[PDB]
Design a protein around this nucleic acid. Structure first.
Ligand SMILES: [Mg+2]
Lengths: 1316, 50
RNA sequence: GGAGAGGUA
């Protein structure tokens, strides 16, 4: 059941749930988005095909020709990823498009063809995403983090009564296009509907309503119900629907059909409407006072004179009624109004409206959009028609149309991309329906309204924004005539496309630098969900509510991984199993539950669909038949956990650990910590430096393997086989016979990335973790990357911790540290820095890199070569010279102050046209020899592979083993064999060998043309030299090392080995923490992790003792069997009966440092299993042992907790922080010291830090602090002379930065001066 | 051709730049007159002077 | 020198 590579060391998995779904590829969001970007789309919906079908074909203005599009094809990259990484250039693909230009005939009518031309034409370098998810843009690996923005659609909202000083709520509605102009509707506090476009000046909505070819009668038809008034001979028989009567007041004798139904003084009850509808009454005799102030619908003009009697939307009076009844009108149409359910909000907005016809509406709109610019008739209709209703300047994507129809309770998922009349009518209809009382508004933090915009979509939008410019230029020049001899390379220009791609991938708002000091840090940076960016909010303009977790977040967005500080919860991270949708919403997987049994089919439920069903909790006890063993089980229905029945559920959770991110699910015993302190731990985990020797975590969570393989740091086998050659630098895998391809048979080679510079100055290396001649399966790790151990994530070390307060050396949060941990050389870390020296062009000419530097002796030049560059491998310290340089009159590079190191690589680049020195030719020639060595070694190892394949297919059908070697390996065809399809296989192999013969003779010279070429540089510089220094920063007081549950602490004393607390067996504790930080910061997870680590190394010491004295494999087999057993119905169940008795010994060597234990996140190892595991060991089951002091030697009463806690060394080293300055250089405009540590800068005595000196009696200290020590330039030199002359006395003066103030006030029209 | 399917004659030039011509306009097409039917040159169609 | 991003307390 277990693979050969996982028999090397098998982690003991606790936990009880069966996994129904493996954790997916952890980087799948980035890879899927970019493979929707660059991949040929036949249907034409995704990628460059979508943008090209949007823009192309482009017509001309005259229309005598047009440019269409055929296909696109990415060129082969000119360099691969690591050569682009070294050189400092984009890892880019040329885009080659088959454009096609027609020519029509002029005198022939619209649509005829003179000629049509076609070619493959290039436009723009697009960066390709690397194999992992990173873009190499300028040698800095950058990741485009996903965005989380407002899903386009229509969003109803209400500012909850905190405006207008009233407590009245003001509902509003945004029509948010994907690309185009927003549209807002809102209610006035006085119930007037208003519109605004793009948050400009507010207008009533009737202007945009009349601008859609509408008049007032049509509007009052649209928004309103009709009430019929029939003047007859007897007192206004009015047609009344009884449903309009409910909740209303009686105002007269409601008597009809000869029956008194309702007296006045009644509210119209249910039974009165009931008796009107059983009595079927449609008309009521009403008095004419019922038209006290009601409104007529339409125009009424006279039948004989033909003159206006009453206008549409006019409040009728009794004289007006007399004029209507005297003109032969019988039907009087009135708008039904109501206090609650039918507000007449449209009518008063027609009253506010100063427009009566359509041109007035268009003139108002054209004024409102562009003030000034005296309006013309054609410009207003053109502006309003391309503002919303053109396919170019407005666009609600498919996502926008989905949300737009799903909001309004329509049915269709698709429709017009642009707005239509019916859409805007529906927006007003639904908004007034909300204002009436039915319907409901949204909450904006709901993940049904927020949408993931990943790297493919943003880059496609930027590419389209570029493409709009180049089609405009093409349209211009194509509309310019005499097209007859023209080709589509001069109409299209690649510079706007390359600009609009290069700007976004190079320097954007969400194109950020890779956090690359772990595998974990980069894999949690490629999954990051930023709410910032264009189209989203900002850090200082974000309220309390968007930062908060919405209950929709369960399973989509992790709630406990979040940066602290100014942006809480804008930089959310994805959950583990979470996926992006087809459209972009965040969907999470769920098991489908049938009538009573939890099945194993899973559906990836979206955000809106989560509310409609009801879904079980992650840990609901089901037992061997899918039955919930209880009747009252905990579920969530609509954002609310409650005890529901056994038989109401719809879905089950896929796993216990689907709530948390991948950065947080590595935390063991996460179900015991706080959430504040677990936030600090899971955010803190991403900064663990890769140590010297990666050591596995004793208490992991089983996600260690998934992170270490899904990150692209471990070299993983592509096809299984037998390893044939392991070096320290390359891996040779002979492929197995079933996995071997017929064409291009070969073998596999991996080149391991040695000691190069990760992006934040740490080393990455790949050590091979396989020895020679071993069976490897597909998907197996072969080379451990930085801070990984045998293909599982191992960020720090795992060491013996005793929770006692120790003599105040661990007072607040500090960490007393034994000197064994630095003696064992297990926290000392490599840091690889890069120092570059330019060769500028200046006045008095260029300067040299020669060794002849003025005023230096052989002490300075004792390490340099003749050509000015230090030897590779020379150890230097601070203040040395790595590169000599001069000024035409000493501008040499120096090692910065304080650092040490070994120079491990020197790269020289020279611009083309400048002679290269002997050093550059020396580097070039070992480069050329090494490249020839690489290509020839690949050729001859692959020749060994081909000849081994040939000898393998010469074992039958003409076997003469001697005749194989009578003639050498070159001619292994013309020996004896039967000419069948076997000989066709040998003939395929022979042409493959001759193909490699061609490939070598061209690839070596292509590599020569790449190496010998003096590269491009900045304009002005001749040659750049980049040395790489490497240091081993060990450990000291001052560093910050932490745990996994956020007990950060500054290591405070490297205590000698003797003084440390030691147990009765004599082993001295490596780290003595502080117990005081546990009861406040509620991280009991660190105490359980300490206990479990102690149990794990108890089993480790038992196996090590059992192996030290020699004992047989039968003892090891039964003991390791008992150790991997003993769970309280755990799921692992590993069987040592099938292990072939070297794999037990191979496993027992790997367990001699302690058995790894896996504790899944919310399916944890309980305390009882820990007690059983400790009892299996020879350790006390309370966890706490008796330590003796190192100094007194006496017993600490109240015996203390020890164990093995997994400690990380964080990347805030004290040698990167410690800083001092007496006097250096000064700033230019203000004569103050500069800031920062890169410039030799002094600190900032700030405003709050001056109030502390005013708050004392201290003044002369303050006076020297902001005059003499900083800015009084006459006084700070005299001070320096006064100390060196041994006289501490100040000349205070007047600070020059006050004179700067005087000039910048006086430079206005303001006189300011000083008096007597 | 923008909603009108037409039959054209693809004549390839130098730098494999294709050229499709209408079948109705067939009298703008002639055979080679240089007599180098196996060794005729290949014009750059548009022009190399750009 | 200025923006942009990320980080520590
Ligand atoms: Mg602090």
């Amino acid at each position: 059941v277990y693979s050969y590579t996982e028999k090397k060391r098998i982690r003991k998995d606790f936990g009880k749930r069966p996994q129904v779904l493996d954790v997916p590829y952890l980087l799948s969001i980035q890879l899927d988005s970019f493979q929707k970007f660059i991949e040929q789309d036949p249907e034409g919906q995704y990628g460059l095909e979508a943008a090209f079908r949007s823009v192309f074909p482009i017509q001309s203005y005259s229309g005598n020709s047009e440019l269409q599009y055929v296909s696109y094809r990415l060129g082969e990259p000119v360099f691969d990823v690591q050569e682009c990484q070294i050189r400092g250039v984009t890892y880019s693909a040329p885009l080659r498009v088959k454009l096609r230009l027609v020519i029509y005939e002029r005198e022939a009518p619209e649509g005829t063809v003179k000629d049509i031309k076609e070619q493959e034409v290039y436009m723009g370098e697009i960066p390709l995403m690397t194999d992992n998810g990173t873009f190499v843009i300028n040698g800095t690996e950058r990741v485009i983090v996903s965005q989380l923005h407002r899903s386009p659609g229509v969003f109803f909202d209400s500012d909850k009564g905190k405006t207008h000083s009233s407590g009245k709520v003001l509902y509003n509605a945004r029509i948010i296009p994907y690309r185009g102009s927003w549209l807002d509707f809102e209610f006035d506090p006085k119930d007037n509907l208003f519109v605004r476009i793009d948050r400009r000046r507010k207008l009533p909505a009737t202007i945009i309503l009349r601008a859609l070819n509408y008049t007032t009668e049509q509007i009052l038809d649209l928004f309103f119900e009709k009430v019929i008034f029939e003047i007859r001979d007897n007192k206004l028989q009015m047609e009344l629907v009884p449903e309009r009567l409910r909740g209303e007041t009686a105002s007269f004798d409601i008597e009809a059909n000869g029956k008194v139904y309702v007296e006045k003084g009644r509210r119209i009850t249910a039974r009165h409407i009931r008796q009107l509808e059983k009595d079927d009454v449609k008309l009521i005799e009403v008095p004419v006072e019922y038209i006290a102030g009601k409104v007529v619908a339409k125009d009424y003009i006279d039948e004989s004179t033909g003159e206006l009697i009453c206008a549409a939307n006019m409040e009728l009076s009794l004289d007006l009624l007399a004029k209507l009844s005297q003109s032969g009108h019988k039907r009087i149409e009135t708008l039904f109004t109501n206090d609650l359910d039918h507000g007449p909000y449209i009518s008063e907005t027609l009253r506010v409206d100063p427009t009566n016809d359509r041109l007035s509406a268009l003139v108002e709109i054209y004024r409102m959009m562009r003030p000034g610019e005296p309006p013309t008739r054609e410009a207003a209709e053109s502006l309003f028609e391309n503002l919303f209703f053109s396919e170019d300047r407005y666009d609600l994507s498919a996502v926008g149309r989905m949300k737009f129809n799903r909001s309004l309770l329509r049915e269709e998922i698709e429709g017009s991309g642009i707005l239509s009349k019916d859409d805007i009518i529906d927006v007003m209809k639904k908004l007034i329906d909300i204002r009436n009382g039915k319907g409901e508004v949204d909450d904006i933090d709901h993940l049904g309204n927020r949408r993931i915009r990943s790297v493919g979509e943003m880059a496609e939008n930027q590419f389209r924004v570029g493409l709009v410019r180049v089609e405009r230029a093409v349209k211009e020049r194509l509309s310019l005539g005499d097209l007859d001899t023209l080709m589509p390379q001069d109409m299209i220009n690649a510079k706007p496309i390359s600009a609009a791609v290069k700007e976004f991938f190079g320097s954007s708002q969400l194109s950020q630098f890779m956090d690359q000091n772990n595998p974990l840090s980069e894999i949690t940076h490629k999954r990051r969900i930023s709410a910032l960016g264009p189209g989203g909010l900002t850090r200082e303009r974000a309220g309390f509510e968007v930062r908060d977790v919405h209950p929709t977040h369960y399973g989509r967005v992790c709630p406990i991984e979040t940066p602290e500080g100014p942006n809480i919860g804008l930089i959310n991270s994805l959950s583990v199993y979470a996926q992006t949708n087809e459209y972009g919403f965040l969907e999470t997987p769920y098991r489908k539950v049938t009538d009573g049994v939890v099945t194993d089919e899973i559906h990836y439920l979206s955000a809106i669909e989560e509310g409609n069903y009801v879904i079980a909790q992650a840990n609901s006890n089901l037992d061997e038949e899918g039955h919930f063993v209880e009747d009252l089980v905990t579920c969530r229905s609509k954002g609310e956990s409650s005890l529901f029945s056994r038989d109401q559920v719809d879905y089950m959770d896929v796993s216990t650990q689907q709530v948390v991110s991948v950065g947080a699910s590595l935390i063991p015993f996460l179900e015991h910590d706080d959430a504040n302190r677990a936030l600090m731990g899971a955010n803190m985990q991403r900064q663990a430096v890769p140590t010297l020797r990666a050591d596995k975590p004793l208490v992991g969570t089983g996600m260690e393997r998934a992170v270490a393989v899904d990150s692209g740091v471990t070299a993983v086998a592509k096809r299984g086989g037998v390893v044939q050659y392991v070096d320290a630098s390359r891996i040779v895998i002979k492929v197995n016979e079933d996995e071997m391809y017929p064409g291009e048979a070969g073998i596999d080679i991996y080149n391991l990335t040695k000691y190069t510079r990760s992006n934040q100055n740490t080393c990455i290396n790949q050590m091979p973790c396989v020895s020679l001649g071993e069976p490897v399966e597909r998907g197996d790790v072969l080379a451990d990357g930085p801070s990984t151990d045998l293909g599982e994530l191992a960020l720090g070390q795992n060491m013996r911790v005793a929770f006692m307060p120790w003599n105040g050396y661990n007072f607040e949060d500090s960490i007393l540290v034994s000197e064994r941990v630095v003696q064992e050389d297990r926290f000392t870390t490599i840091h690889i820095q890069e120092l570059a020296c330019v060769s500028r062009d200046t006045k008095l000419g260029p300067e040299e890199i020669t060794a002849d530097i003025p005023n230096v002796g052989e002490a300075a030049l004792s390490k340099l070569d003749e050509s000015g560059i230090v030897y590779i491998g020379a150890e230097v310290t601070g203040g040395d010279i790595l590169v000599g340089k001069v000024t035409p009159k000493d501008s040499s590079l120096r090692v910065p102050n304080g650092v040490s190191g070994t120079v491990i690589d020197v790269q020289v680049f020279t611009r083309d046209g400048v002679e290269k020195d002997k050093r550059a030719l020396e580097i070039e020639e070992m480069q050329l020899k090494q490249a020839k060595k690489d290509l020839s070694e690949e050729l001859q190892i692959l020749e060994a592979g081909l000849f081994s394949r040939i000898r393998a297919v010469l074992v039958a059908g003409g076997v003469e083993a001697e005749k194989l070697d009578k003639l050498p390996r070159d001619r292994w065809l013309e020996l004896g064999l039967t000419d069948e399809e076997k000989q066709n296989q040998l003939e395929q192999l022979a042409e493959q060998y001759d193909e490699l013969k061609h490939e070598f003779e061209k690839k070596l010279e292509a590599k020569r043309r790449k190496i010998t070429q003096g590269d491009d540089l900045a304009p002005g510089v001749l040659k750049i030299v980049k040395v790489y220094l490497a240091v081993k920063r060990r450990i000291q007081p001052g560093d910050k090392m932490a745990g996994r549950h956020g007990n950060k602490g500054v290591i405070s004393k490297i205590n000698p080995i003797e003084d440390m607390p030691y147990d009765e067996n004599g082993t001295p504790v490596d780290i003595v923490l502080n117990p005081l930080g546990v009861p406040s910061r509620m991280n009991i997870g660190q105490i359980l992790e300490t206990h479990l680590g102690m149990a794990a190394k108890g089993i480790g010491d038992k196996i090590n003792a059992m192996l030290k004295q020699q004992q047989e494999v039968a003892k090891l087999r039964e003991f390791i069997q008992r150790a991997y057993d003993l769970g309280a119905d755990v799921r692992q169940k590993v069987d040592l009966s099938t292990f072939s008795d070297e794999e037990v010994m191979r496993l027992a060597e790997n367990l001699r440092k302690g058995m790894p234990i896996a504790t899944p996140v919310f399916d944890g190892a309980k305390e009882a299993e820990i007690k059983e595991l400790l009892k299996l060991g020879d350790l006390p089951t309370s966890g706490q042992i008796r330590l003796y002091d190192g100094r007194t030697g006496e017993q600490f009463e109240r015996p203390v907790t020890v164990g093995y806690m997994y400690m990380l060394k964080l990347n805030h080293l004290v040698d990167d922080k410690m800083h001092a300055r007496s006097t250096g250089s000064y700033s230019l405009v203000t004569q103050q010291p500069l800031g920062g540590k890169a410039q030799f800068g002094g600190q900032r005595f700030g405003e709050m830090e001056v109030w502390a000196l005013e708050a004392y009696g201290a003044a002369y200290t303050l006076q020297e602090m902001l005059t003499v020590k900083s800015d009084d330039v006459n006084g700070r030199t005299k001070m320096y002379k006064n100390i060196v002359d041994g006289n501490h006395q100040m000349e205070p003066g007047m600070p020059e930065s006050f004179n700067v103030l005087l000039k910048e006030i006086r430079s206005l029209g303001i006189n300011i001066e000083l008096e007597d | 051709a923008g909603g009108i399917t037409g039959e054209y004659l693809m004549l390839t030039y130098a730098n494999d730049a294709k050229l499709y011509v209408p079948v109705s306009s067939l009298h703008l097409i002639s055979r080679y007159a240089g007599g180098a039917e196996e060794n005729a040159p290949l014009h750059k169609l548009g022009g190399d002077a750009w």
